[PDB]
Write a protein that binds this ligand. Sequence first.
Ligand SMILES: [Ca+2]
Length: 555
Amino acid sequence: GAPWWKSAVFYQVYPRSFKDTNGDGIGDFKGLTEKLDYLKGLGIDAIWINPHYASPNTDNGYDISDYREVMKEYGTMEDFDRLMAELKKRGMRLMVDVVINHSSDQHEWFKSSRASKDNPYRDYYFWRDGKDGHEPNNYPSFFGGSAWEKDPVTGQYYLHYFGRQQPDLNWDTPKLREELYAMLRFWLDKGVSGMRFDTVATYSKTPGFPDLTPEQMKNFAEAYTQGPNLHRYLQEMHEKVFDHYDAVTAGEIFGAPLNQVPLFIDSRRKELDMAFTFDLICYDRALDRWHTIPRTLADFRQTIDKVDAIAGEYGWNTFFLGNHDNPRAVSHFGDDRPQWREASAKALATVTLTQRGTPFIFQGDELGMTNYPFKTLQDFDDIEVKGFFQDYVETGKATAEELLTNVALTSRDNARTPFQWDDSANAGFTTGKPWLKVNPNYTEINAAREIGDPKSVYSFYRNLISIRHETPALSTGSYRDIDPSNADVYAYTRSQDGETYLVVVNFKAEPRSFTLPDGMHIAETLIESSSPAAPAAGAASLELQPWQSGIYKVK
Ligand SMILES: [Ca+2]
């Protein structure tokens, strides 16, 4: 049959904001472990946790100083091993982030590498002579300024596509690749069975490091994804590591042209199993990265369609509406106003759990958690906001009020407010002071209230997950968008083995009449949200309530 990961439902945990168990205001491993019964009851097959490794935390745990030790704030290695044992007892799996484009500059490999020109760690990184009293070339960093940083100790520059404190690892060095593979086995042998390769497209560097041409400088991110040994290295990794495990691998793919996505995920190529791309979640984001741009459902579905098409017959996509870097799903894609929050959250759940691909639910979206009501720029932890302030407010391009109004809608801090467990102090997230303020709407929106209520957003997610689990077409089935130009009602089929299901979701806060394709008829209604009655068997049309969603078997 199909690989386990194609029919699994994943849940993303950002452990810092999930559950604190020692009152320091920061979520931890023990907190996740104590909530596994909750996640199991929701119907979750596998949990992806954000970086859990030893890190100085200059970049949210993506600057790793020891790949074989855990992040101290989350707990100890034994806490981690206990988490794995409790997952295994429940038949659940763990996926981890793998950040091997670069390490922390505090990694012992880098401390050794930088110490002299002649040491066995020199080539674990990229060290080059400057040119003409300047850097080795004109490479810009994703985080601003030059991608080359001089080290007075040897007089050479080291490469960092990202932060200055994140030197790129040298995949051209076989010994380095072998270290990385050994490290991956360390985690897989502990029972980890999913690995998400962050910024996977930048692993391979261009031989000789020529200057970027003026055209390339205008999209340097794309140039950095075109290293000539990229797919060779991923194939080697697959052969040396993943051939020996049942684990799923996923690539965080960005910077590359859409048409290159299949190279990472086509099963025949033996590279990675599935793709994370950002076309949908960034579909309404302005170029400045803090404004939004008006879009419609037509744009939404067309974006879904082109990514689904790119996976084709042999590739596989993840699907998500939320993550740790983005505004809340219901606020972003639904309508978080009080009249529509629950209805639209349910509609987005139906979309999520009937998309072709492996769905990832972001912690708290199953409750219909919303964006946070920021009142001042001082309310943001978000390091990006500080940068926007410097680049746009201090330069006089925008006022602080304009920045606040808009980043409130787009900031990743919206996703990072603590998970709302109940209506006790700080929503039961912590007995102390939470590292980031809890949304005051926790008094209404919390797991304790929702789990006990058959009509809640939580209960609807759980019901959908059960339906998806028992309906093969809704995971591995084909997908067909009935009308990509329609900006009111999202309608599509999922089909497998002669069984065809129709999904219909009203994206308007108004009644809409929906006519099935001529010749198609409803056989059964599996589930609906915001509907007072299912259609009759034989129906050729639906009368949809505001934000109504449904899954139907068609004749
Ligand atoms: Ca803690």
